[PDB]
Design a binder for this molecule. Structure first.
Ligand code: CAC
Ligand code: CAC
Ligand code: CAC
Lengths: 68, 67, 68, 67, 67, 67
DNA sequence: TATGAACCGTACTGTCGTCTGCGGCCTTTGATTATCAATTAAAGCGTTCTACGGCGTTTTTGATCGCTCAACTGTGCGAGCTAGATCTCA
DNA sequence: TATGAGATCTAGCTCGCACAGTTGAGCGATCAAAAACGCCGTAGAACGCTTTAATTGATAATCAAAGGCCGCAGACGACAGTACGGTTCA
């Protein structure tokens, strides 16, 4: 669990939530981290397909146009 | 930009990336934050529909199954 | 409708079908052609992400590695 | 090899490809043929589950909802 | 949450678990219930495709093939 | 057969089934129980690998990512 | 990874509450026989679009070079994670 | 509407995110020889179309069976409250 809980809680709060449960925060944390991992994997596959070793923003933006 | 860059960089690195550009990190940050905001909004609408004011984990888990 | 109907009908026949409706054949034709177009499009985006303009088998296998 | 190569090449061309390798055409051919076989099999099982022996469009459209 | 927790806990116990967390029991409960709902839906689609209104064991056994 | 039939029947009913055969209920029961046993076993092996003896929800959530 | 150590947080015994399970009768739906049209297979026709090169040529993909740029030490001020009290919904 | 349940708030104690050069490396460039795709006219093997004709999938109606619903005795899942073996800290 690399992602911190507090900023995500602040996200849910900024979304319009009066009160936010810790379970919701941790859940959204694990979910967002999961999506991050998947998108990262796709971007890596893309960059590796592009003959490059460094992950650029292009790889992320292209990998994100395929769910998740 | 509520989400920090370093942990996300650690995510991309743990995914199998030898080197990661800062632009990629910031991009993935904005993307994850966007998804977070949207999902949070949906969960808020669900919980508000459920007669509750506090966002519980069920609201999140149900909201993510609406993408 | 780029794809011919008869070979696809022969595919359904080779699958184990005693009798095959024409509606089923044309339907499967439109479906397979649709899938083909989608996969081709994805492979094109992948190759275009690369330094190439020509679509190679790698692009096809990678686009099919992320589903139609 | 039930499927012809040329129409599929024309499909890739209609997708927006300037130049297309033969390997890509044959690969996409084998892939589309594979999917065709799988969907056909599923549709056959579907119709066989029913009181019919003939494969109708309904069976295909229902079998394709299994990816 | 239609499914009870205790029998599932007994399942995990019969699997070879010395001690079982309640979170694990509830998790496996919701998961198994989810799978049950999905399989039930598929079986319903199957029986409705078969021109019948009653869900028979055939529909379940065929719906569980997805897999 | 650790799992009860009635709640599963209520699941199939909640899925949209007008009428449900008892054979279908028992079948889905045995299926869900089977999946439960397999997933439980996998989770047990997972927890046994992690240096813990107690099965937590994490082990289940990781075991279900094998299907 | 090994030594403990404080503390979650289980297994536990036992009690209460609900839920299943089951046999009752009934109502509806499941196959089943029989009829009858829908339609799909089989063959044979004509015509098209396949597959196959031969060359001309766009396009790769080699190799080598500055060159931005990401990783990686160390630092300070920021940021989250925690513990406890108070209330606000659940 | 009564009560745990639990989320917000306050404060502070760390924790790791942010940052600034430094060093080294992967990246985009520059042409360049060569794989390799496109073009296109040719021979031919297909797809398509169509009528014969029989197998089939509906329709209709009668029969039997098989869930649904109701209600009851008994099973067992849920729920505190308490010693402790286990987990996750250091
Ligand atoms: C205090 As608020 C912005 O989470 O409603
Ligand atoms: C040759 As083209 C214009 O169909 O990509
Ligand atoms: C005693 As056991 C098989 O439930 O761990």
């Amino acid at each position: 669990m690399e992602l911190p809980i507090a900023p995500i809680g602040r996200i849910i709060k900024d979304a319009g939530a009066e009160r936010v449960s810790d379970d919701a925060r941790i859940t959204l944390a694990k979910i967002l981290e999961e999506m991050g991992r998947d998108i990262a994997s796709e971007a890596i596959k893309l960059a590796r397909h592009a003959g490059r070793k460094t992950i650029k923003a292009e790889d992320i933006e292209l990998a994100v146009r395929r769910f998740k």
